[PDB]
Amino acid sequence: HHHHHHMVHITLDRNTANSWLIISKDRRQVRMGDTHQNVSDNKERFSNYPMVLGAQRFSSGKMYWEVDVTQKEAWDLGVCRDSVQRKGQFSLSPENGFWTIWLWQDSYEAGTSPQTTLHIQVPPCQIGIFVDYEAGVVSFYNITDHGSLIYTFSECVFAGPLRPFFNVGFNYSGGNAAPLKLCPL
Numbered sequence: 140h141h142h143h144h145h146m147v148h149i150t151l152d153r154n155t156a157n158s159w160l161i162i163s164k165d166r167r168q169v170r171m172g173d174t175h176q177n178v179s180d181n182k183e184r185f186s187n188y189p190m191v192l193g194a195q196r197f198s199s200g201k202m203y204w205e206v207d208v209t210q211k212e213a214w215d216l217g218v219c220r221d222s223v224q225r226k227g228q229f230s231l232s233p234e235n236g237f238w239t240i241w242l243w244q245d246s247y248e249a250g251t252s253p254q255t256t257l258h259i260q261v262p263p264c265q266i267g268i269f270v271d272y273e274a275g276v277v278s279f280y281n282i283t284d285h286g287s288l289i290y291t292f293s294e295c296v297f298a299g300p301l302r303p304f305f306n307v308g309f310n311y312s313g314g315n316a317a318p319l320k321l322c323p324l
């Protein structure tokens with residue numbers, strides 16, 4: 140792909156994070172802590188899952204960024220509406236304001252309702268995410284496999300400002316402690 144020139148510098152918003160996440164000083168890395176991270180509760184925090192939003196809001200234009208997922212067993216990545224539900228249980232779907240893919244139990248799936256099987260021959264270590272607000276497109280690229288397309292959501296109905304969306308995945312297994320990292324431009 141030739142989307143690299145729409146690169147944007149994403150930083151994580153501490154205030155949206157689940158209370159067990161640890162965000163690095165530079166706001167470019169996030170990982171699951173082994174306990175509550177000693178922060179106050181607020182209405183922005185995701186309560187049920189280890190999720191956090193980027194600080195940036197997008198309402199026009201073309202945007203591209205990359206995330207490092209090396210050695211993780213589980214994660215969700217993409218964009219969401221600024222007004223998505225934060226508390227309680229919910230599915231990642233466009234109807235709920237999410238445009239996402241994920242890894243879970245050795246399979247990759249797109250967050251459609253119901254979910255769509257992805258066909259990945261080379262397990263990605265870094266994922267590229269492209270958003271075209273006007274066109275209604277969210278695309279995912281396999282940076283480890285020369286930028287090969289993973290999945291395109293088209294005819295998206297964003298219906299609001301978008302924020303970068305992250306889930307570090309649960310760590311019940313002891314094999315999913317590694318961070319999500321925003322990769323340099």
Ligand SMILES: CN1CC[C@H](Oc2cccc(F)c2)C1=O
Nearest residue numbers: 157159186187188189309310311
């Ligand atoms: C080993 N464990 C136990 C808790 C953590 O999972 C979570 C993460 C966020 C919210 C939540 F309610 C639970 C995990 O991966």
